[model samples]
Target: SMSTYDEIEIEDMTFEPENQMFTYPCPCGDRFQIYLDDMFEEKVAVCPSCSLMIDVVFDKEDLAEYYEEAGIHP
Candidate 1:
């Protein structure tokens, strides 16, 4: 199936330090979420409520430490 998405800044997404996920409001009355570990390779955020997705942009290097602290690698 085809998926629709909008480009959103990394800053617009909220970070969950404990859960290690990023979340943004979705138009489908739900929220789009992506894992921090997954961000290293994936730039897509998917909304659980619908089939909508979004493009996320961020520096890979900037998040290296976060991955390191989390004991995960991308």
Candidate 2:
């Protein structure tokens, strides 16, 4: 199955983050988004199409530690 993503125009904001949660480090750049699930203690994120469970990070401190471990960026 061939899948494609539509290009959307995005405005730049130096001080503002793209999303409040769900920050992901990609090869090209850093991405962030919010996936609102039930107001539970934990929200498991998984790809519905492929059943690939996506890792979730809800804290800045944790994210910083992850970045250091993964060597994504300083």
Candidate 3:
């Protein structure tokens, strides 16, 4: 669908799966995550705040990487 500015939503989709990102909540009241290092490479992240229940979606690998680089794995 095109927006009011005539920009196609499809056009916003990046062919590079690495550029893709998403986040949402599960039926169990836990957050869920989905991302791609590449197409079909879905990496599900577990949220530390909620232990194994909640999931955290990371859009930018840099942010995810920062957690490690900053020594904040939690």
Candidate 4:
């Protein structure tokens, strides 16, 4: 069975303006990454190096600011 490693706020993660993705360091020496648009429906950020995943907590309303930073309008 699969399980989440932890629940993390989006604010704690680093936003990559180039890819418009949010990333956080994973204990496995890789990062848990999820794209901005993906956050709307897919709330899990997965680590490519290991079988660990995290629940990303965020508000849809807060997406506006991120979109602006990414130069995306909707």
Top TM-score hit: 4
Query: Which of candidates 1 and 4 reaches a greater lDDT?
Result: 4
Q: What does candidate 1 score on TM?
A: 0.74
| lDDT, candidates in the order shown | 0.77, 0.31, 0.34, 0.85
The count of backbone overlaps in candidate 4 is: 0
Q: Please give the distance, in angstroms, between residue 54's alpha carbon in candidate 1 and its true position after superposition.
A: 0.2
Q: What is the Cα-based lDDT of residue 34 in candidate 3?
A: 36
lDDT of 2 by residue, 1-74 (tens): 21312211111111123222343323334442323222123333323334233334243333443334344444
| Best-matching candidate per lDDT | 4
TM-scores, one per candidate: 0.74, 0.26, 0.25, 0.89
lDDT of 4 at 64: 83
Query: Which lDDT tens digits does candidate 4 get at residues 12-72?
Result: 9889899988999999899999988887657888888898999888776688878899987
Candidate 4: worst 10 consecutive residues by lDDT? 35-44
Residue pairs in clash, model 2: none
Best first by TM-score, ranked: 4, 1, 2, 3
Question: Model 2 off-target regions past 4 Å?
Answer: 1-40, 60-74
TM-score: model 2 vs. ground truth: 0.26
lDDT of 1 at 43: 80
Displacement of residue 64 (Cα, Å) in model 1 is: 4.6
Model 3, 1-74: lDDT tens per residue? 11121111222322223434443444456543334333134334333245442223234344454334334333
Q: Write the per-residue lDDT of candidate 1 for residues 1-74, one digit (tens) a residue.
A: 32548877777778777778888998878988888767765888888878888888777667765666666566
**Per-residue error (Å), model 2, residue 26:** 12
